[PDB]
Structure formats: structure tokens, C-alpha cells
Design a protein around this nucleic acid. Structure first.
Ligand SMILES: [Mg+2]
Ligand SMILES: [Mg+2]
Ligand SMILES: [Mg+2]
Ligand SMILES: [Mg+2]
Ligand SMILES: [Mg+2]
Ligand SMILES: [Mg+2]
Ligand SMILES: [Mg+2]
Ligand SMILES: [Mg+2]
Ligand SMILES: [Mg+2]
Ligand SMILES: [Mg+2]
Ligand SMILES: [Mg+2]
Ligand SMILES: [Mg+2]
Ligand SMILES: [Mg+2]
Ligand SMILES: [Mg+2]
Ligand SMILES: [Mg+2]
Ligand SMILES: [Mg+2]
Ligand SMILES: [Mg+2]
Ligand SMILES: [Mg+2]
Ligand SMILES: [Mg+2]
Ligand SMILES: [Mg+2]
Ligand SMILES: [Mg+2]
Ligand SMILES: [Mg+2]
Ligand SMILES: [Mg+2]
Ligand SMILES: [Mg+2]
Ligand SMILES: [Mg+2]
Ligand SMILES: [Mg+2]
Ligand SMILES: [Mg+2]
Ligand SMILES: [Mg+2]
Ligand SMILES: [Mg+2]
Ligand SMILES: [Mg+2]
Ligand SMILES: [Mg+2]
Ligand SMILES: [Mg+2]
Ligand SMILES: [Mg+2]
Ligand SMILES: [Mg+2]
Ligand SMILES: [Mg+2]
Ligand SMILES: [Mg+2]
Ligand SMILES: [Mg+2]
Ligand SMILES: [Mg+2]
Ligand SMILES: [Mg+2]
Ligand SMILES: [Mg+2]
Ligand SMILES: [Mg+2]
Ligand SMILES: [Mg+2]
Ligand SMILES: [Mg+2]
Ligand SMILES: [Mg+2]
Ligand SMILES: [Mg+2]
Ligand SMILES: [Mg+2]
Ligand SMILES: [Mg+2]
Ligand SMILES: [Mg+2]
Ligand SMILES: [Mg+2]
Ligand SMILES: [Mg+2]
Lengths: 119, 82
RNA sequence: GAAAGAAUUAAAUUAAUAUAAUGGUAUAACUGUGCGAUAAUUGUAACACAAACGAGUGAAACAAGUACGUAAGUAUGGCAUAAUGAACAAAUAACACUGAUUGUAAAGGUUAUUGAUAACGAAUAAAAGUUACGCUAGGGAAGGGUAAUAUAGCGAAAGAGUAGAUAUUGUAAGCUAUGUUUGCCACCUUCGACUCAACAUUUCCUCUUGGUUGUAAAAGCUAAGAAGGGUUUGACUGUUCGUCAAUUAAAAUGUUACGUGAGUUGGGUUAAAUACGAUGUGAAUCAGUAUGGUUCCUAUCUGCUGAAGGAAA
RNA sequence: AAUAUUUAAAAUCAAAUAUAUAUAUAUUUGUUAAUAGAUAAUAUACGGAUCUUAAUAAUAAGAAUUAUUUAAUUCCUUGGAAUAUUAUAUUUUAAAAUAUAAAUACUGAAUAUCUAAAUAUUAUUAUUAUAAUAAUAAUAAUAUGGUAAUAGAACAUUUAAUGAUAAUAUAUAUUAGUUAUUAAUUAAUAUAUGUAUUAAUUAAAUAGAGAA
RNA sequence: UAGCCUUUAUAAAUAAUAAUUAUUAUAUAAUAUAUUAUAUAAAGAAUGGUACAGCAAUUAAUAUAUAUUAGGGAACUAGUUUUUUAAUAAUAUUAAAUCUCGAAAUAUUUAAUUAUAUAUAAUAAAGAGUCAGAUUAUGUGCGAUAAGGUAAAUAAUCUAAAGGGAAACAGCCCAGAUUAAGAUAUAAAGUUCCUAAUAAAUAAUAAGUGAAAUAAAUAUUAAAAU
RNA sequence: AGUAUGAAAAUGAUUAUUUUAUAAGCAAUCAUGAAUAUAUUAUAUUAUAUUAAUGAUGUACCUUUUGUAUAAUGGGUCAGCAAGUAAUUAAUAUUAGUAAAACAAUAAGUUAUAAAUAAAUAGAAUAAUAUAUAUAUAUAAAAAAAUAUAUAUUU
């Protein structure tokens, strides 16, 4: 290994904060998507925008992917997530079966919340 | 109701399927704002690119001209010709 | 209540399938049996699959004829996926298309068939070696990485040690370090001697110290600190190495382009000459042996050794 | 206290979210550290300085390491409210009371916006003179990194055809201005020439050289 | 030659790209134990056999004071018991590139709908270049779970990509330079000084451990929980 | 190797301005003091020009490569010279001329005007779009594959 890819094995505090922020943003996006759909469905039934926003009973999304994203068991929120799953991917070939998320290529775009139950 | 979607991240490190999805959605460059009438189809498409994009719901959409007008900064002066 | 039939359910595709292996097959594609021996037939084949082209694959339908079946229908070889070869040039038939003045002919064409190019998209009907006497065009179409090996260490301790695994020793298996050996990779196209050495410490000698029923003493053995100083001269060999002789307090192990050829040498390795043994029909060749045998360089910069001038004191 | 395990949130408990809901069900989260082991050759090598806190004593420092977090702290549902803080002003006796503010952490690209300019296309205009056109100028949008390559548009140079003009001119050179500028033009200065095969349009090329 | 690139055009043109709907079940309401609507749940039309999971059948491995089949010993008077040797059965437990009876996600993929049209497909007439690739990540073959190794699979970047970060850096993290301007949002990465920018909270470390390139078995000392 | 002329460059010496004897690397760019020079509108607290205070950024150029600051290629500097050109043809495209004809006008020829077929004496609505017709295979004639031809004016 003569070429030096000087990437540290762990993240800085600032990196971790940024990661957390990014995670929070994707959750927010999902929430917005569900909310807009609900609003649209309220409008279709025949309420005003404000009335829809007020509504006690929020409509859950019917499409599959959205519904999965909504579930925390499948796609957890940043507040829900463990410290470890925010900053460590599962890597079967690593010692500890774990690897920094920053070592994943395009980790800033690519999402990866859920690790295996005991790894 | 309308999703105001914004292409927050670039499409440089992004695979080709996700690029194609973005193109279909209508977003060109980074921070290129697009309003979309809400429906299941557009919602699913947005979910597919959830990490590149910032979405927020709105009462009304805005045409490109309106958006431009909103953007324009205040010229702090009033011309008086003589 | 009994007999017979129709059968159904469960199981099975482990047998069998001309043949490999895989998929399929009892609704059988497997097996038996009647007829038959025909469809292992003739012209057009769309449309698909596959697919650079050349080819390859499945195939509805239309038309001619055939075999089985009461009929419905089925059959354009085999349950499927291998079982193969272009043109050119020849050859054989059929076709009735051309017939170089006309008529015949010859010769060419169409249709069907024939043999191989296995380096298997086949360059020709037909082609092996050798060069250290070689030549031209180009390409690189010890260092670096690795650490299996090697060297060193650690953990655990079977077992030796007159008795006691751990004074000293330490099987096979376990965990590391090193980049000193032999490899592997292919980013990257000279061994020894002399001379002068610089560095490391994993210490051979000298200084300090722990352990040593195996430290009585003296010699030792083993371990910790320690790189200040020191660490060989000859016979043999090109040798480093090694064997020995005589010494020494000791004759440590490396690194430095296995330090040092714009500093020396040129014995080894090395081309032209020649011979020997072996190999080859031979030219010639060799993880062979032997004699002979070619590079040079006034120092621009860095650096180092000395010596001046200028300068801000 | 002693012996022996484990180093765990699966179970278990606690806390939080979601469905009927003072409870049940389902989901999510929470379970050690230090040292030794430790190791080669130009020179210490976190990139370097340097970083580990301390009363008396500061209008003042106290990780710049590791882990979990925040953007002053606490409740309620990004937002408001309360709480003290900090700074400031005022009033009263260096303190107290009142009130105003700060709470949007910041740096950071040739990213995006704004701000202007250019070209190209799409869609609207305006002005001036295939007028369903051309030129120029507006607005909105999209686009404008590029080797091999493809396509489009220009300029310098030399010759041929046509061709005013003139030493108050032309050419070449130098210097300083000008025009979104390989080019040309203005002025000054110099040297030549009684003068552009000149501007422009065509035709062509021994038509552009830091790389053999 | 095809693949990928370019130019100019063609339409009774959206055929392209992306997603949704499509299914199953539950509850409620309305009609005729069925249908429709609404809401919710379910990795949700069709195709599949990798991960995972599993030991079924195949191929392999282990154990039984268990049973049977025989054999070698052994005690009394050929019969009999025990300590057994193998095979077979029974029961329990295990794994495999060429085992998958269970089984994902990603994937392949169809209709209509919506969204992309200053956008795509297809076709027609013409021009190319290229056929030495590299690294990173993931899943493998070879190698020794060695190589800046080798061989291919998927994605990205470099190739041909300047800018910020990673000390320096082809391939990593961000992000694509038409020309400027420099007010505002920022990305990755940072905020004691060098060096543009910082204040807090709660724990832990005392080893300069560490502070952008994490070194192992094991040992010692603590700390929690039982 | 003509004759004039020659502030063309490389190159040398000298002078002037400016910087430089405690500072380290493509020698440039940007920031930014100072000094000097020129300036018939510097009115100035002015403008331009020249100049390695000081600060920041900055790994020559080409070639060849997966990849070069490379210690890979090549170049001592400057001046001049040094590379997709022509002929005979073919196919496309754009425009222009003419147009069911074009070129050529002496005739002759080439291309077009009809598609086929190896080739032959065959060749395009019997009453309209293919369901008709033509050709090649086949045939009594159809059907079948393929391509072509037809819905005031021929293309
Ligand atoms: Mg089978
Ligand atoms: Mg296909
Ligand atoms: Mg074909
Ligand atoms: Mg058979
Ligand atoms: Mg058969
Ligand atoms: Mg031949
Ligand atoms: Mg004749
Ligand atoms: Mg061959
Ligand atoms: Mg071949
Ligand atoms: Mg041959
Ligand atoms: Mg010889
Ligand atoms: Mg090496
Ligand atoms: Mg013993
Ligand atoms: Mg051993
Ligand atoms: Mg030592
Ligand atoms: Mg003694
Ligand atoms: Mg001393
Ligand atoms: Mg040497
Ligand atoms: Mg030398
Ligand atoms: Mg001989
Ligand atoms: Mg001699
Ligand atoms: Mg749990
Ligand atoms: Mg060191
Ligand atoms: Mg640093
Ligand atoms: Mg920009
Ligand atoms: Mg360009
Ligand atoms: Mg020329
Ligand atoms: Mg020149
Ligand atoms: Mg140039
Ligand atoms: Mg080609
Ligand atoms: Mg569609
Ligand atoms: Mg497999
Ligand atoms: Mg199955
Ligand atoms: Mg697949
Ligand atoms: Mg290749
Ligand atoms: Mg090449
Ligand atoms: Mg490689
Ligand atoms: Mg290349
Ligand atoms: Mg690109
Ligand atoms: Mg770059
Ligand atoms: Mg751009
Ligand atoms: Mg340290
Ligand atoms: Mg380090
Ligand atoms: Mg000085
Ligand atoms: Mg430096
Ligand atoms: Mg480089
Ligand atoms: Mg060089
Ligand atoms: Mg050099
Ligand atoms: Mg040279
Ligand atoms: Mg016939």
C-alpha cells in the first residue's frame, strides 16, 4: 500500500454533527412528503388547505415505499437511531464487523440507517 | 397543494438511475427550484431521491417569472431624471 | 351385510430417457402393444428469439402429396440443449435459361448432391532450423509493493533437567514484529578486492545489575541497563562465505543503490579467437570446463576540505 | 467483606414513539477503562508550535484528547412562553429596581442566489429599415469544463479580378491611449516613398511553428 | 463490424425516462353469504432462487449402559450372559462453488395514469474516434481471506475536470470554470496560533494515551452487573 | 555569392532609474508600501509608466501514457525555412441553372423516365387501395414470402 489514502478510521465531532443534520433532513423530507399527500387527500374529500392542516386524523400514505419509510423499524429517525448506527456501518470483512460510515463511498448522499440486529 | 422541491445536492457522485429520476422530476442544476402538484406518483419519485432533494409543501405554486421577481434584491435608490 | 366394477387419495420421476451434464418428463417426454414405415415429404415461410457481419434457433399460416386415428386431430425425424466447416477450383445428375456470324456444339448459369481447410472465419496446391559475426525499426506495451519462506520476539507449556514445566532447556499447534534470506508481483528497463568509511543496536569485548536445589570459589549459563571506546593477521579459493594456522579483551550482527568503478582494481561474471565433455542430421548450442581478451571524462550546480575578498559595526 | 462468573438492553428493567387509550399492544433506545505487550539503520516528526490547571487574585486561563450532545437554560406545541445570563441605558442608595437588546453560532468552493456583461435556443415585446424579414435593444427560461472526435463562425499573411484617394498622404517601426482587443485604430516620434493591386466583394494559396 | 460520439432532417409522432395504480387481509357503511365505497395494515400485478435461513432428498460429520444383524472373547451344565467390533435402524445434534423443501432487498418487467416537451425515444441521409485503461467501494475466481498482484461483475470518479477538503495527493470526501462582480445562502471539511472561523453542556482519560494513516494473542491493575 | 537599406532578434560592453549583502525553490500572478520618470486641463489629496520592501498563491513546456514536477521523450538561444496537395474517378450533401427531362447540339453517348429475375420471347386497377396489378418461387388459376405499381394532373 504505497499510495496514501489518508482517511482516518473515525470521524471528528464536526463531521458527526453534519451527519446527524443530514439524517434529520432526510426524516424531514419524508415527513413533508407524507404531509403533502395527506393535505391533497383532504382537498380531494373537500376541505380547505388550512382545514386539512388542522385535521386531527392524518392520512397515512398508501404507496408502499412511503409507508415503509414511515415505519421506524424499517427506516428510523435520527432521534430514534442508536449512536452506533449514525456513525458506523456494518462491514462483514472488518474486525468488529463494523466500519465508519465516512468510509462508505458517497456517504453524504447515500442513506444507511438500519444495521443487522446483533452486528 | 404543491411540493416545492429543490435539488440540494449535486448529481456528480450519484448513480445513473438516480440521475434519471432527478431529470424526470424536472430538476436541472443544484438549487434549481421546481413546484410539483402533489400526487402519489410524484411523492414516490421524491422518496426515491430523498437525500439529494429538499421538499416543502405549499398552498400555491409559483411560475418562474414570479420566483424571479421574488428573488430580485432591493435597489436602494430612486432615479429622478433631469 | 357381501361380491364385482369404476376408481379416487397418498407416494413416486430416486427407475427409465440412444449417449455427457443440467433442466424436463407418471397429464408421462418412460414402458408395452396394433397399424405402419409414412412427415428422416415438396414450393412459399410471416413474426419472434438470439445477433457486428457470416451464421444459429423457435415457428403461425398458405399451397401439393402421404401415414396413423371412429373422430378430434397428430406427424416437415429423435424430451431438450453437442454431433461441426465459408468461398474459390473440380466432380455427378436434373433444369431448358444463355448459346459471341447462323444452326448444332462447347462453355457458363439455375436446382440438388460430393469430398476439408481441427492453428477449426479456412492467407499458398506447396516451406524447418541457426547466429556469442550479426543488422534496422520500436517497446521496455537493483528501486517499489508483498511477507509464503527466512530472521527475531511474545503467549500458553507437552517434555527434558539425578527430585521440580518456567536455573537452563521449550515438540506440534497459537499471536506478532522485521524487511537482513529464498520467493511472488511487474509501477519501474555486476560479484569480490583496495580506499575511505557514516549510521543502527537485535551487544561480541569493556562498565553497572537481577536469576542461577542447577551462584561455595574460579570459570560459566541465562536475563535487564549500556552504542563511550574497541572489535585480526596469515595459508587455500575470483570468491563474500567456508576450512584451517597463529593471535586477541573481543575477533557481534546488520543498514547505507546487498555504501563506495565521473575514487582504484578487473580475479569472477561477461561478446568476438580456440579446444574439451555432453546435446543436435547440421549450422550451432550448454543453471558445463578451460586459455586469451576494450570504454573514457579538464567538474557547471549541489555537497564537502581548505583559503581569500566584500559586508551593517 | 469473601468466593466465582459475565461485561450483557436477547431476556429483564427504565425511557421515548405509534395504534384503542390514566391501561394494553407494537416499535425504538440505554450495559467498562487504563497500562504493558510496542521494535533499525541521514533527523524529533500529531503537517508544525504546542495542548493536560491553580486557591490566594485578577473587567481575564483551566484540553487544543476521547465519548454523547447543544447552539444561553427549562417546559409547551421549526414555533412561542418562562427562566436566569451577558451588555447597555435610566432611576435610586460599588449595589438595588425598571427597561432595551442579543439569542437567527461562525468560516468555507470557480456550488446556488443577487448584481451586471456575452453567445445560443425557446416564448413574448420595443425601436429602426422569406417586414411571416433583417439589424439592434428589452424581459422570463434553459444551456455554455473538455482529450480523441464531429460541426459552425471569424481573423492575420500572399497573389489575381474591380478600385476613389494623396507629402495636411501612405507604409514600416517604437512608445503611450482607444474598441470585449490573435486584430485594427488614435497621437507623438523616426525613416522611407510623389506613393497603396489600398477599403470592400469575390477567386484562390508554398496562408499562421516552443516542439520532427 | 457492432457498442459509445457528431451533423442535418422526418412525422396521422410520446412510442422515451421516473413514479403511481394493479394485490392480499382487516374494520366501517351501503346494496344483492356476494359486490361497491372509505379507512387502515401488509416489503403489496407477473418473472426469479442469491444473501439469509435450513438439514428435507443428495453428498458429508458426531454421539448413544437404545434396538437388530453377525463376529471375537467369557462363566456354568450345544444352550447363556456380559464386555464389546463393525454395519443397519431409531433418537438427538451439525455443513456444501457445482444441496435448496423456506426465503428477502436490490433486480428483470407490463398496461393505463400522472410528471418531464426550451425534453426524450424511433427512423432516414451522412462523418468519426476508440478496441493498452486506472483507482475507490461492494460481492467473488486465482493467490497464502498476500501484493500499488491477477481475472472478470455493479457504481462512481480519473481518463478528458479546473475549484474547496484530505499536510503534500490522477482515481477518496464535496462540487462541474461562458465573462465578471463579491452582498446573501451554503457543500465537504474546519473554527488556540501558524491559518479564513467558537462558545457551551455532561461524562471518561493522566497514559502526551491521544491530538486525519486505530498493532494482535496474552498479562497486570482497576470499574460495573450478577 | 546581385545592389541598396537595415532602432528584427539572439548576443556583448557601458550608462541611467529602481531593488538587492539574515535569505531558500518554474522567478510569474495578485495584493501593497516606497523611489524615480513622463504628463501645454497635476485644479490635487492627480494620472500613467518603470522598479524581486513586504504579504499571499503558484510542482516549466511539449510528446507518450492507466498515470509524469518527474530523476520518462525532445529542445543551448534567436532569425529564416519545414507537413492533408494534385490528377482521374465513385458516392453523399447544400445551393444555383434547366426540369419529365438534364448535360450536349455534329452525331454519338451518360443519367433519369419501371419494378424484377441467374437468365429467357415476361412487365404494373378486367369495375379502384389492396382485398387490384407487376415481377421472382410455385401454378390450371388463385393463395403464400418479398419488393414495386396505381386513390384538373404523369414522377
Ligand atoms: Mg434429471
Ligand atoms: Mg434483443
Ligand atoms: Mg441476420
Ligand atoms: Mg428418445
Ligand atoms: Mg420419441
Ligand atoms: Mg485455395
Ligand atoms: Mg456461335
Ligand atoms: Mg488462424
Ligand atoms: Mg480462427
Ligand atoms: Mg505455414
Ligand atoms: Mg563463443
Ligand atoms: Mg523491496
Ligand atoms: Mg517431566
Ligand atoms: Mg514451535
Ligand atoms: Mg539494547
Ligand atoms: Mg562465581
Ligand atoms: Mg561520558
Ligand atoms: Mg553494492
Ligand atoms: Mg556518478
Ligand atoms: Mg564434442
Ligand atoms: Mg596474453
Ligand atoms: Mg429489546
Ligand atoms: Mg522515528
Ligand atoms: Mg493538522
Ligand atoms: Mg457559478
Ligand atoms: Mg467549450
Ligand atoms: Mg507555409
Ligand atoms: Mg520562427
Ligand atoms: Mg504556441
Ligand atoms: Mg466503427
Ligand atoms: Mg406511457
Ligand atoms: Mg450459485
Ligand atoms: Mg424452491
Ligand atoms: Mg440478479
Ligand atoms: Mg483491450
Ligand atoms: Mg493506443
Ligand atoms: Mg490494477
Ligand atoms: Mg488517452
Ligand atoms: Mg464526466
Ligand atoms: Mg483536481
Ligand atoms: Mg458549466
Ligand atoms: Mg502522541
Ligand atoms: Mg499516526
Ligand atoms: Mg537585509
Ligand atoms: Mg518551503
Ligand atoms: Mg502528479
Ligand atoms: Mg526532465
Ligand atoms: Mg531536475
Ligand atoms: Mg536534451
Ligand atoms: Mg416456373
Amino acid at each position: 500500500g504505497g499510495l496514501l489514502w489518508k482517511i482516518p478510521w473515525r470521524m471528528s465531532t464536526h463531521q458527526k454533527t453534519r451527519q446527524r443534520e443530514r439524517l434529520r433532513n432526510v426524516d424531514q423530507v419524508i415527513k413533508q412528503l407524507t404531509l403533502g399527500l395527506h393535505v391533497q387527500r383532504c382537498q380531494d374529500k373537500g376541505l380547505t388547505y388550512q382545514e386539512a392542516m388542522e385535521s386531527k386524523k392524518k392520512y397515512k400514505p398508501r404507496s408502499k415505499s412511503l409507508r415503509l419509510l414511515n415505519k421506524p423499524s424499517v427506516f428510523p429517525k435520527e432521534n430514534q437511531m442508536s449512536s452506533k448506527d449514525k456513525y458506523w456501518t456494518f462491514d462483514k470483512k472488518a474486525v468488529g464487523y463494523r466500519k465508519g460510515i465516512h468510509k462508505v463511498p458517497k456517504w453524504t448522499k447515500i442513506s444507511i440507517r438500519k444495521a443487522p440486529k446483533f452486528f | 397543494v404543491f411540493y416545492k422541491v429543490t435539488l440540494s445536492r449535486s448529481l456528480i457522485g450519484v448513480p445513473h438511475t438516480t440521475k434519471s429520476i432527478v431529470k424526470s422530476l424536472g430538476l436541472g442544476k443544484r438549487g434549481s427550484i421546481v413546484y410539483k402538484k402533489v400526487n402519489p406518483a410524484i411523492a414516490g419519485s421524491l422518496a426515491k431521491v430523498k437525500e439529494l432533494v429538499k421538499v416543502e409543501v405549499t398552498e400555491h405554486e409559483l411560475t418562474p417569472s414570479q420566483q424571479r421577481e421574488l428573488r430580485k434584491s432591493n435597489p436602494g435608490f430612486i432615479v429622478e431624471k433631469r
